[PDB]
Design a protein around this nucleic acid. Structure first.
Ligand SMILES: NC[C@@H]1O[C@H](O[C@H]2[C@@H](O)[C@H](O[C@@H]3[C@@H](O)[C@H](N)C[C@H](N)[C@H]3O[C@H]3O[C@H](CO)[C@@H](O)[C@H](O)[C@H]3N)O[C@@H]2CO)[C@H](N)[C@@H](O)[C@@H]1O
Ligand SMILES: NC[C@@H]1O[C@H](O[C@H]2[C@@H](O)[C@H](O[C@@H]3[C@@H](O)[C@H](N)C[C@H](N)[C@H]3O[C@H]3O[C@H](CO)[C@@H](O)[C@H](O)[C@H]3N)O[C@@H]2CO)[C@H](N)[C@@H](O)[C@@H]1O
Ligand SMILES: NC[C@@H]1O[C@H](O[C@H]2[C@@H](O)[C@H](O[C@@H]3[C@@H](O)[C@H](N)C[C@H](N)[C@H]3O[C@H]3O[C@H](CO)[C@@H](O)[C@H](O)[C@H]3N)O[C@@H]2CO)[C@H](N)[C@@H](O)[C@@H]1O
Ligand SMILES: NC[C@@H]1O[C@H](O[C@H]2[C@@H](O)[C@H](O[C@@H]3[C@@H](O)[C@H](N)C[C@H](N)[C@H]3O[C@H]3O[C@H](CO)[C@@H](O)[C@H](O)[C@H]3N)O[C@@H]2CO)[C@H](N)[C@@H](O)[C@@H]1O
Ligand SMILES: NC[C@@H]1O[C@H](O[C@H]2[C@@H](O)[C@H](O[C@@H]3[C@@H](O)[C@H](N)C[C@H](N)[C@H]3O[C@H]3O[C@H](CO)[C@@H](O)[C@H](O)[C@H]3N)O[C@@H]2CO)[C@H](N)[C@@H](O)[C@@H]1O
Ligand SMILES: NC[C@@H]1O[C@H](O[C@H]2[C@@H](O)[C@H](O[C@@H]3[C@@H](O)[C@H](N)C[C@H](N)[C@H]3O[C@H]3O[C@H](CO)[C@@H](O)[C@H](O)[C@H]3N)O[C@@H]2CO)[C@H](N)[C@@H](O)[C@@H]1O
Ligand SMILES: NC[C@@H]1O[C@H](O[C@H]2[C@@H](O)[C@H](O[C@@H]3[C@@H](O)[C@H](N)C[C@H](N)[C@H]3O[C@H]3O[C@H](CO)[C@@H](O)[C@H](O)[C@H]3N)O[C@@H]2CO)[C@H](N)[C@@H](O)[C@@H]1O
Ligand SMILES: [Mg+2]
Ligand SMILES: [Mg+2]
Ligand SMILES: [Mg+2]
Ligand SMILES: [Mg+2]
Ligand SMILES: [Mg+2]
Ligand SMILES: [Mg+2]
Ligand SMILES: [Mg+2]
Ligand SMILES: [Mg+2]
Ligand SMILES: [Mg+2]
Ligand SMILES: [Mg+2]
Ligand SMILES: [Mg+2]
Ligand SMILES: [Mg+2]
Ligand SMILES: [Mg+2]
Ligand SMILES: [Mg+2]
Ligand SMILES: [Mg+2]
Ligand SMILES: [Mg+2]
Ligand SMILES: [Mg+2]
Ligand SMILES: [Mg+2]
Ligand SMILES: [Mg+2]
Ligand SMILES: [Mg+2]
Ligand SMILES: [Mg+2]
Ligand SMILES: [Mg+2]
Ligand SMILES: [Mg+2]
Ligand SMILES: [Mg+2]
Ligand SMILES: [Mg+2]
Ligand SMILES: [Mg+2]
Ligand SMILES: [Mg+2]
Ligand SMILES: [Mg+2]
Ligand SMILES: [Mg+2]
Ligand SMILES: [Mg+2]
Ligand SMILES: [Mg+2]
Ligand SMILES: [Mg+2]
Ligand SMILES: [Mg+2]
Ligand SMILES: [Mg+2]
Ligand SMILES: [Mg+2]
Ligand SMILES: [Mg+2]
Ligand SMILES: [Mg+2]
Ligand SMILES: [Mg+2]
Ligand SMILES: [Mg+2]
Ligand SMILES: [Mg+2]
Ligand SMILES: [Mg+2]
Ligand SMILES: [Mg+2]
Ligand SMILES: [Mg+2]
Ligand SMILES: [Mg+2]
Ligand SMILES: [Mg+2]
Ligand SMILES: [Mg+2]
Ligand SMILES: [Mg+2]
Ligand SMILES: [Mg+2]
Ligand SMILES: [Mg+2]
Ligand SMILES: [Mg+2]
Ligand SMILES: [Mg+2]
Ligand SMILES: [Mg+2]
Ligand SMILES: [Mg+2]
Ligand SMILES: [Mg+2]
Ligand SMILES: [Mg+2]
Ligand SMILES: [Mg+2]
Ligand SMILES: [Mg+2]
Ligand SMILES: [Mg+2]
Ligand SMILES: [Mg+2]
Ligand SMILES: [Mg+2]
Ligand SMILES: [Mg+2]
Ligand SMILES: [Mg+2]
Ligand SMILES: [Mg+2]
Ligand SMILES: [Mg+2]
Ligand SMILES: [Mg+2]
Ligand SMILES: [Mg+2]
Ligand SMILES: [Mg+2]
Ligand SMILES: [Mg+2]
Ligand SMILES: [Mg+2]
Ligand SMILES: [Mg+2]
Ligand SMILES: [Mg+2]
Ligand SMILES: [Mg+2]
Ligand SMILES: [Mg+2]
Ligand SMILES: [Mg+2]
Ligand SMILES: [Mg+2]
Ligand SMILES: [Mg+2]
Ligand SMILES: [Mg+2]
Ligand SMILES: [Mg+2]
Ligand SMILES: [Mg+2]
Ligand SMILES: [Mg+2]
Ligand SMILES: [Mg+2]
Ligand SMILES: [Mg+2]
Ligand SMILES: [Mg+2]
Ligand SMILES: [Mg+2]
Ligand SMILES: [Mg+2]
Ligand SMILES: [Mg+2]
Ligand SMILES: [Mg+2]
Ligand SMILES: [Mg+2]
Ligand SMILES: [Mg+2]
Ligand SMILES: [Mg+2]
Ligand SMILES: [Mg+2]
Ligand SMILES: [Mg+2]
Ligand SMILES: [Mg+2]
Ligand SMILES: [Mg+2]
Ligand SMILES: [Mg+2]
Ligand SMILES: [Mg+2]
Ligand SMILES: [Mg+2]
Ligand SMILES: [Mg+2]
Ligand SMILES: [Mg+2]
Ligand SMILES: [Mg+2]
Ligand SMILES: [Mg+2]
Ligand SMILES: [Mg+2]
Ligand SMILES: [Mg+2]
Ligand SMILES: [Mg+2]
Ligand SMILES: [Mg+2]
Ligand SMILES: [Mg+2]
Ligand SMILES: [Mg+2]
Ligand SMILES: [Mg+2]
Ligand SMILES: [Mg+2]
Ligand SMILES: [Mg+2]
Ligand SMILES: [Mg+2]
Ligand SMILES: [Mg+2]
Ligand SMILES: [Mg+2]
Ligand SMILES: [Mg+2]
Ligand SMILES: [Mg+2]
Ligand SMILES: [Mg+2]
Ligand SMILES: [Mg+2]
Ligand SMILES: [Mg+2]
Ligand SMILES: [Mg+2]
Ligand SMILES: [Mg+2]
Ligand SMILES: [Mg+2]
Ligand SMILES: [Mg+2]
Ligand SMILES: [Mg+2]
Ligand SMILES: [Mg+2]
Ligand SMILES: [Mg+2]
Ligand SMILES: [Mg+2]
Ligand SMILES: [Mg+2]
Ligand SMILES: [Mg+2]
Ligand SMILES: [Mg+2]
Ligand SMILES: [Mg+2]
Ligand SMILES: [Mg+2]
Ligand SMILES: [Mg+2]
Ligand SMILES: [Mg+2]
Lengths: 56, 58, 159, 56, 172, 185
RNA sequence: GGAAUACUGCCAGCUGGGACUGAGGACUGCGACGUAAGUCAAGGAUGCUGGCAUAAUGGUUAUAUGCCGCCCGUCUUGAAA
RNA sequence: AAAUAUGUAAGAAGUCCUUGUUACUUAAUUGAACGUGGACAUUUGAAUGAAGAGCUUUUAGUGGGCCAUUUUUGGUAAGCAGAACUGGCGAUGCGGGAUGAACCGAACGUAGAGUUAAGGUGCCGGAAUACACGCUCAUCAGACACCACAAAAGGUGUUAGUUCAUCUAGACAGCCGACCGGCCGAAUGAACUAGCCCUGAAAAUGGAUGGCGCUCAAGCGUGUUACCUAUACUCUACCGUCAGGGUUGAUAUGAUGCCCUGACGAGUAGGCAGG
RNA sequence: GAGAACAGAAAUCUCCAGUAGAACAAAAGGGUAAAAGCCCCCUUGAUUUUGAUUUUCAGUGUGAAUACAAACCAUGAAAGU
RNA sequence: GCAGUCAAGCGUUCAUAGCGACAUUGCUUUUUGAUUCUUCGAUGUCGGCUCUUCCUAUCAUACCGAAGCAGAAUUCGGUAA
RNA sequence: GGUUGCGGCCAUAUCUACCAGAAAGCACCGUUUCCCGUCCGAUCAACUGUAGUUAAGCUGGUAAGAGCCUGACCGAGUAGUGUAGUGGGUGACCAUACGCGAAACUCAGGUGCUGCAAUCU
């Protein structure tokens, strides 16, 4: 979270996270429109937390 | 009868399986295609700087 | 019939620039090229002798030979999947002196001189380059600049 | 107060593994997302920032 | 573009060594969240000044609540929108208890009778109608009259049991 | 589904035990497999791998190749190891002493190794004398000296040699072999 | 002017209902609760009660029902054709 | 003169200091290469990734291809002919598009549970005859990408909007003595725009929004939530494959073993393996 | 463009202007202005030897081409080519 | 092949009763091409005769609207297969 | 600073007009025996620096001058373009999303910089 000097290897040490589908749906009808238009697929900024948490 | 003529389709694909390699360079490259009277005189410049170490070491 | 000869399609490519023609100036002839020099290849139409094939136009390679009027340049082109080693014998009107590596020397040299500053002081080096960064927090003054508020403009025809 | 821009980002790949163009496809591998609904952390820099947005 | 908020969005060109302190610009943006509103901002500013989002930065974003949200108001609405064959301007009047609720019903009307989706609509100006009698559109005027009372005939009551044991009535 | 960045269920190209059935060879491996595992000695790993090699990869190490390696500075007394058979070479004359640990020695090799007063050690004997393989000099025969490796990569302008049954004139010297008939290579 | 409330977000806050799973098989690990003796939910289910031999239960087979299922082989860009 | 695409560099094979060789080179101890001896590491000199890096031999099939988006040539055009890039079909099932080579979603060892994608949730049919604002009445209404067509041109149908003109210096309709006046008391006139609908709109067996049927929809535009279920995602058991690690120091009955760990599993032609 | 016996639209002579608007065998494109054009002077590098390199490419052949080496020549005051 | 739209012009007068140039939007698949997907281990190839049924872009007949319809005749059109 | 021999970049250096130019240098200019070249001492050659001169070449300045060089949230984030959706439209086309982004236009400013050598109120 603090990034910092060894973030490269600290993050690379971490295996990529295997996640389930969002519990309670993706909130949109269609995923592959951009978040600003139709939802998902893009940088949703702080809204990544509500999503990732539901995929956890 | 008539048939296809040419295509490049799928060739980028085939050439990326095992493909695209790299020039596989070494130090001390080959001298191929260098001035002859350089590579002639260059022989004796090395022929002579040999004796220089065939003396110094003793 | 199809026509594939040596200089085909080079019409615009081998043209000299608008209001640049005739004899090539002396900076080109007065340049020195030793082995290992990294040179950019761009042909010159005024000089027909010893000019690159249209492929090597824009390519950059390391000169492997120095002769009377020309320098041999080794270049890497891809055929099928691999790069073979091409070597061209090109005259000096068609050879530039590549600025790609030139700054790297001015980088190393500045790196060694900043090393003596950690030798004579002992602070941390920070030698290797780092890409542009997220920027930072700041404060924007409303003093003398107060946000002026805009709306969208209506539709009107201008002709 | 204009906050510091974010230094740290979390990317979960929401697209399957089928029918992806090479340059995005290679990028998703370099960010270590080769499987759907998987995610990694990424340090935000104009180097990796361009790896995103191309992957968007 | 879902259920609507108002945002003061303030942004500026990036400062340069030549020009520190470039001018701040504010827009009121009706959007469903901060990510759209921020994006919405740059959309119009790129339609006005020479700026990209890449070249600029956003100084602030703040939500704007209605000051008198339980007070009924009459709203003027100025809208530019593209149509199928052309792009034109409109004045509409909406009577509601906030600007959000009014823009909320604005986009539906532009969808219902003009087939105008969000992306093809610019909201040029939305302001409260200061007095009555400055109200132009007659479909608002009807509810401005003194001592206004009307019935709601033919009452249809949603059932729950799928079979009912008497002929229902609408009488209200 | 995964987008695979490398090929699934690929096996490494290297052998595991030999392909040979020789029960004694299979024992020497059982020895040196154990050795290489329970030691720090890298030599045992090296010998273990070299025990799986195929007769093309274990070319004969000539005695003269052993002798010249003892003339190496500082290695003079070391016991030399060859993981394959060792040959006699009449071309030398004065051959030093040492001891040579190999799989097999030709009759001339063995007998002439001892005429200079030296031992032919067999690989388990070498293991007992040198469990960490210390003060050992490992020798390899040439594998590119082979016949078949002369014809490999036979292209135009590659100067290699063609697969050919008879040889002389009349055989593949005319068109393409000289500027006078066709072209040259 | 002093709250309240909404909204978004955090808690290594406390609790109720349902579902599937019990891989492993002496001890070795990391722990936590302990003044201690010791106890535990801490490197994978145990305790308790009952039910079954004219048999519970499981296999096969026939029939029925819900949904599904075009003729293989071949050539072919493409075959139920 | 772009965008996209494109050659090169980002080090220890580095940057330098010195001065030995030669038949080359210079006015020349000038050079040129190649050496001798010596100065400097710690972010060793961008990010990101690496399921390991390099190398060799041999040999199957193939050498009719086709499709989508985009750029693109010939042709009035074609389910036509021909190129470019990528993705696909072929060689591939699965969920969705009723139906379907190529579309959308997702790629497949055997299973359980959870969640989802594309697509849906009146009834056929799993899932709200859900909430919300409007529009639409069609004597073939309409109903959702690819996709299974309709155009110019019209409409005093209805809906919103624009412009210009008149109007509280009281108009416009109406009743009252062309024009004027009294009462009234807020609009009026014309030209337009585009929504839905209507005309435009003619073919041969009887018939197809998939089907019934639906009219404040079960239609069209828009918003907000709940819900349904793929061979996909998450958790776990089991089979196999590949990889890494431990282990006859033993005490039987297998060291090709026994044991621990991680990842992976589509397939025609074809190759190889174990049976 | 402005100027001279016959001499006229067209003969030969002059001056000024002239970035190539001409010429360079030919197709077309590129290139060239104290030249690559016009004109004159001298010559036979359109020669000997034998390798390397580029295009096409399988990195075979062939055609054409580029930079050298070793000779022996042409040209010029020369550097050069 | 069939039919729209604009309406310069025709029709004594008079665009549109009936017509209609320049243009322009279409439909149709009883024309001919274009193509080469299906069929070359075979789908009997012209016309007629016979018989059924469907289409409507209506020749007649039923009921109508329009006319440059006095009557008579004719012409344009609607519901009509 | 002027000036010249050789220059580098090769218009901020070119074009057109009109003025100004001390010192030195450059020229213009006098000469036709000799080498030399032409139809023609015009160009080329040689002699002289003596007979003459800034009129020109040349160097500067001036021009709401031509052209050229430069700048800018000037126009323009326009044209175009990379990526995206089961976006809109019968179509032709078009919008939106994440990015890259001109040329014309316009306003504004500028009109050679400089190397080695020599020389001069
Ligand atoms: N610095 C110790 C070195 O030890 C070396 O010898 C010993 C070991 O260090 C070396 O071990 C292997 C080596 O065989 C092989 N060729 C390379 C491998 N990286 C080495 O391993 C080494 O590095 C790995 C990875 O970092 C470590 O896990 C390991 O402990 C370490 N010994 O092999 C020898 C034991 O088998 C050399 N004598 C020399 O380089 C030096 O003395
Ligand atoms: N060893 C047995 C002998 O081998 C002989 O063959 C070997 C040589 O004698 C034979 O060489 C021939 C030779 O036959 C003949 N009489 C003279 C000829 N110049 C030689 O040829 C030689 O030069 C040519 C190129 O010119 C090469 O191709 C060849 O390899 C080389 N050996 O090539 C073989 C070696 O490579 C005979 N074929 C055979 O009958 C006889 O029994
Ligand atoms: N990135 C630095 C690298 O250093 C490398 O240098 C490596 C080698 O060149 C050098 O090797 C030397 C060798 O030159 C010399 N002729 C023999 C000497 N025994 C070797 O030494 C090396 O190997 C031995 C044996 O395993 C080890 O014991 C020892 O630790 C090691 N320094 O040892 C270095 C490794 O320790 C290379 N120059 C190159 O790859 C690169 O510059
Ligand atoms: N040709 C014979 C060779 O000459 C060499 O010397 C010749 C050059 O290599 C040597 O030059 C050296 C150079 O070697 C070395 N690597 C770098 C050094 N800067 C050079 O020095 C040079 O430049 C400096 C000024 O910078 C001058 O004062 C000096 O005279 C000059 N030679 O100067 C000589 C002429 O330039 C060495 N003596 C040697 O390798 C050998 O004898
Ligand atoms: N459910 C039927 C609806 O009509 C569609 O299909 C319609 C078209 O195929 C067809 O339209 C044709 C037109 O192509 C062709 N010119 C012949 C016919 N006179 C027209 O029919 C049309 O008549 C008029 C307009 O002309 C319309 O009012 C009427 O609704 C429409 N049927 O009429 C069909 C029925 O209306 C689709 N089957 C379906 O997607 C849609 O829901
Ligand atoms: N022949 C004696 C009498 O004359 C009658 O007179 C009829 C004819 O003179 C004339 O009829 C014409 C006919 O000549 C011609 N061949 C065919 C045309 N369609 C008919 O036309 C008439 O009749 C048709 C059908 O009834 C009507 O639709 C039409 O309006 C009418 N003008 O117009 C009269 C009817 O309008 C009839 N022929 C007949 O029935 C009657 O007994
Ligand atoms: N003739 C019919 C069709 O015309 C099309 O023409 C298209 C092209 O000429 C041009 O499209 C360009 C495209 O070429 C270029 N490579 C990318 C660019 N974004 C497109 O732009 C176009 O389409 C986008 C789509 O969202 C619109 O937003 C945009 O306004 C429009 N100018 O504009 C047309 C579409 O607006 C295509 N050539 C092809 O589909 C087909 O030929
Ligand atoms: Mg749920
Ligand atoms: Mg959905
Ligand atoms: Mg839905
Ligand atoms: Mg949860
Ligand atoms: Mg969860
Ligand atoms: Mg053929
Ligand atoms: Mg073919
Ligand atoms: Mg052909
Ligand atoms: Mg391979
Ligand atoms: Mg051609
Ligand atoms: Mg150019
Ligand atoms: Mg250019
Ligand atoms: Mg030539
Ligand atoms: Mg950021
Ligand atoms: Mg990462
Ligand atoms: Mg950044
Ligand atoms: Mg927010
Ligand atoms: Mg502006
Ligand atoms: Mg306004
Ligand atoms: Mg308009
Ligand atoms: Mg108004
Ligand atoms: Mg309204
Ligand atoms: Mg718009
Ligand atoms: Mg009820
Ligand atoms: Mg009841
Ligand atoms: Mg009842
Ligand atoms: Mg799998
Ligand atoms: Mg060797
Ligand atoms: Mg060798
Ligand atoms: Mg050779
Ligand atoms: Mg032989
Ligand atoms: Mg011959
Ligand atoms: Mg020949
Ligand atoms: Mg108070
Ligand atoms: Mg207060
Ligand atoms: Mg809360
Ligand atoms: Mg507690
Ligand atoms: Mg158990
Ligand atoms: Mg414990
Ligand atoms: Mg305790
Ligand atoms: Mg304790
Ligand atoms: Mg304890
Ligand atoms: Mg019991
Ligand atoms: Mg049973
Ligand atoms: Mg079925
Ligand atoms: Mg067959
Ligand atoms: Mg067939
Ligand atoms: Mg076929
Ligand atoms: Mg096939
Ligand atoms: Mg075909
Ligand atoms: Mg079949
Ligand atoms: Mg020396
Ligand atoms: Mg890594
Ligand atoms: Mg093969
Ligand atoms: Mg073949
Ligand atoms: Mg074939
Ligand atoms: Mg086809
Ligand atoms: Mg087809
Ligand atoms: Mg189609
Ligand atoms: Mg075809
Ligand atoms: Mg095609
Ligand atoms: Mg392309
Ligand atoms: Mg595709
Ligand atoms: Mg496939
Ligand atoms: Mg598939
Ligand atoms: Mg299906
Ligand atoms: Mg369909
Ligand atoms: Mg399907
Ligand atoms: Mg898609
Ligand atoms: Mg149901
Ligand atoms: Mg939909
Ligand atoms: Mg349709
Ligand atoms: Mg059809
Ligand atoms: Mg229509
Ligand atoms: Mg219309
Ligand atoms: Mg209308
Ligand atoms: Mg009207
Ligand atoms: Mg109206
Ligand atoms: Mg008014
Ligand atoms: Mg009225
Ligand atoms: Mg009005
Ligand atoms: Mg039909
Ligand atoms: Mg129907
Ligand atoms: Mg449907
Ligand atoms: Mg019905
Ligand atoms: Mg119905
Ligand atoms: Mg339904
Ligand atoms: Mg609706
Ligand atoms: Mg609900
Ligand atoms: Mg499963
Ligand atoms: Mg193992
Ligand atoms: Mg398999
Ligand atoms: Mg596979
Ligand atoms: Mg198989
Ligand atoms: Mg097979
Ligand atoms: Mg088996
Ligand atoms: Mg002229
Ligand atoms: Mg011109
Ligand atoms: Mg010539
Ligand atoms: Mg030409
Ligand atoms: Mg030209
Ligand atoms: Mg010129
Ligand atoms: Mg010379
Ligand atoms: Mg017809
Ligand atoms: Mg008339
Ligand atoms: Mg009339
Ligand atoms: Mg015809
Ligand atoms: Mg066919
Ligand atoms: Mg046919
Ligand atoms: Mg048949
Ligand atoms: Mg046939
Ligand atoms: Mg038959
Ligand atoms: Mg028949
Ligand atoms: Mg017959
Ligand atoms: Mg016939
Ligand atoms: Mg009809
Ligand atoms: Mg009729
Ligand atoms: Mg008739
Ligand atoms: Mg009349
Ligand atoms: Mg008549
Ligand atoms: Mg008659
Ligand atoms: Mg008719
Ligand atoms: Mg009938
Ligand atoms: Mg004179
Ligand atoms: Mg003179
Ligand atoms: Mg003067
Ligand atoms: Mg000017
Ligand atoms: Mg300037
Ligand atoms: Mg579309
Ligand atoms: Mg954009
Ligand atoms: Mg870029
Ligand atoms: Mg820029
Ligand atoms: Mg000037």
């Amino acid at each position: 979270i603090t990034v910092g000097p060894h973030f490269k290897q600290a993050n690379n040490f971490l295996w990529p996270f295997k996640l389930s589908n969002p519990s309670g749906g993706w909130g949109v009808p269609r995923k592959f429109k951009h978040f600003i238009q139709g939802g998902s697929f893009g940088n949703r900024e702080e809204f990544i937390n509500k999503l990732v948490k539901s995929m956890n | 009868a008539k048939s296809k003529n040419h295509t490049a389709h799928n060739q980028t694909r085939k050439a990326h399986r095992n493909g695209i390699k790299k020039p596989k360079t070494y130090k001390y490259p080959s001298l191929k295609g260098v001035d002859p009277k350089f590579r002639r005189n260059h022989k004796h410049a090395l022929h002579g700087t040999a004796k220089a170490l065939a003396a110094a070491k003793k | 019939g199809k026509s594939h000869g040596y200089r085909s399609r080079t019409r615009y490519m081998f043209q000299r620039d608008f209001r640049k023609h005739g004899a090539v100036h002396l900076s080109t002839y007065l340049k020195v090229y030793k082995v290992g020099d990294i040179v950019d290849i761009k042909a010159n139409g005024s000089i027909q002798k010893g000019m690159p094939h249209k492929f090597y136009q824009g390519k950059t390679g390391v000169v492997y030979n120095v002769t009377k009027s020309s320098v041999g340049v080794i270049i890497n082109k891809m055929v099928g999947n691999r790069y073979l080693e091409k070597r061209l014998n090109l005259r000096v009107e068609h050879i530039k002196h590549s600025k790609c590596r030139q700054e790297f020397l001015e980088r190393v040299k500045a790196n060694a001189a900043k090393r003596a500053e950690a030798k004579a002081q002992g602070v941390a080096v920070q030698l290797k380059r780092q890409p542009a960064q997220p920027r930072e927090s700041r404060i924007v003054s409303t003093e003398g600049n107060v946000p002026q508020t805009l709306a969208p403009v209506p539709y009107e025809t201008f002709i | 107060y204009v906050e510091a821009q974010h230094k740290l980002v979390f990317v979960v790949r929401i697209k399957g593994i089928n029918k992806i163009p090479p340059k995005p496809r290679k990028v998703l591998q370099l960010l270590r997302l080769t499987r759907i609904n998987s995610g990694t952390f990424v340090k935000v820099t104009k180097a990796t920032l361009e790896l995103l947005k191309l992957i968007e | 573009m879902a259920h609507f908020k108002e945002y003061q969005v303030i942004g500026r060109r990036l400062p340069t060594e030549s020009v520190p302190e470039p001018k701040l610009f504010r827009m009121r943006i009706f959007a469903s969240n901060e990510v759209i509103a921020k994006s919405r901002y740059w959309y119009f500013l790129q339609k006005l000044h020479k700026v990209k989002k890449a070249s600029g930065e956003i100084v602030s974003i703040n939500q704007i609540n209605e000051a008198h949200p339980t007070k009924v108001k009459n709203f003027g609405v100025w809208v530019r929108y593209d149509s199928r064959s052309g792009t034109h301007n409109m004045y509409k009047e909406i009577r509601d208890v906030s600007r959000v609720a009014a823009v909320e019903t604005l986009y539906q009307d532009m969808a219902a009778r003009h087939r105008a989706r969000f992306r093809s609509i610019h909201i040029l100006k939305v302001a409260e109608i200061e007095k009555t009698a400055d109200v132009k559109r007659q479909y608002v005027k009807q509810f401005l009259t003194k001592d206004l009372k009307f019935p709601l005939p033919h009452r249809v009551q949603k059932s729950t049991k799928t079979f009912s044991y008497k002929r229902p009535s609408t009488f209200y | 589904g995964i987008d695979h960045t490398s090929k699934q269920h690929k096996r490494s190209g290297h052998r595991t035990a030999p392909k040979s059935d020789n029960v004694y060879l299979k024992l020497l491996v059982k020895l040196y497999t154990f050795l290489a595992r329970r030691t720090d000695a890298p030599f045992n790993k090296v010998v273990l791998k070299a025990l799986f090699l195929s007769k093309i990869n274990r070319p004969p190490v000539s005695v003269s190749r052993i002798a010249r390696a003892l003339k190496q500075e500082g290695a003079a007394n070391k016991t030399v190891v060859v993981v394959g058979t060792v040959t006699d070479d009449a071309r030398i004359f004065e051959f030093p002493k040492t001891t040579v640990a190999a799989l097999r020695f030709t009759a001339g090799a063995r007998a002439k190794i001892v005429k200079a007063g030296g031992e032919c050690i067999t690989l388990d004997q070498l293991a007992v004398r040198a469990p960490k393989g210390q003060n050992t000099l490992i020798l390899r025969g040439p594998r590119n000296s082979r016949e078949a490796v002369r014809h490999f990569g036979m292209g135009p302008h590659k100067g290699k040699a063609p697969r050919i049954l008879s040889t002389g004139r009349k055989f593949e010297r005319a068109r393409g072999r000289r500027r006078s008939k066709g072209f040259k290579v």
